[PDB]
Amino acid sequence: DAAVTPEERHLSKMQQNGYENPTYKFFEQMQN
Amino acid sequence: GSSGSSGPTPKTELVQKFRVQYLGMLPVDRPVGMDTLNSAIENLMTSSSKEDWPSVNMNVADATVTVISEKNEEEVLVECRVRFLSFMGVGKDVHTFAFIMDTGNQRFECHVFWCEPNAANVSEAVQAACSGPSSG
Numbered sequence: 001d002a003a004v005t006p007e008e009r010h011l012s013k014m015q016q017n018g019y020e021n022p023t024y025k026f027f028e029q030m031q032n
Numbered sequence: 033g034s035s036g037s038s039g040p041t042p043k044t045e046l047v048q049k050f051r052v053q054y055l056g057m058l059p060v061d062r063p064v065g066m067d068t069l070n071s072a073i074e075n076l077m078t079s080s081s082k083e084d085w086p087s088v089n090m091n092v093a094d095a096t097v098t099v100i101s102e103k104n105e106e107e108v109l110v111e112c113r114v115r116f117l118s119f120m121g122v123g124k125d126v127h128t129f130a131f132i133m134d135t136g137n138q139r140f141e142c143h144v145f146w147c148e149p150n151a152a153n154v155s156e157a158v159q160a161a162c163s164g165p166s167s168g
Binding site: 007008010011012014015016018019020021022023024026 | 063064066069114115116117118119120121122123124126134150151152155156159162163
């Protein structure tokens with residue numbers, strides 16, 4: 001299994017996994 | 033009956049800046065959520081047109097995401113502080129990039145954009161802004 005593009009990952013990642021800003025600190029509910 | 037508030041002002045610093053497009057503003061429910069974001073991109077996508085999306089300038093500093101008019105430079109459009117920012121990602125196309133921001137109350141607004149080619153640099157300048165995978 002070859003390694004795909006590095007950047008693409010950063011994107012593909014967000015496209016799904018996305019991104020949750022921690023600094024925000026959303027009262028209640030402690031992200032796993 | 034009474035109230036008051038105040039705040040400091042920004043200074044002069046080298047900003048990354050990122051010329052892109054403005055899909056528009058899409059309403060959301062939660063401050064986070066993938067289906068909550070995509071929905072926007074999708075909404076705006078169909079909602080407005082591709083050519084409709086005006087040209088803007090996404091300012092990305094140490095930890096601040098501001099949308100200043102393309103033409104004017106002293107004409108802010110959207111002030112998304114990496115601190116305020118809650119969620120951010122892309123839709124079905126990496127060429128797009130949306131993010132949720134808390135204006136004040138529990139209310140949350142999402143701002144999509146059209147980067148070219150992809151939104152790797154943009155999202156990057158944002159992801160890194162938030163904090164990134166340890167830069168220092």
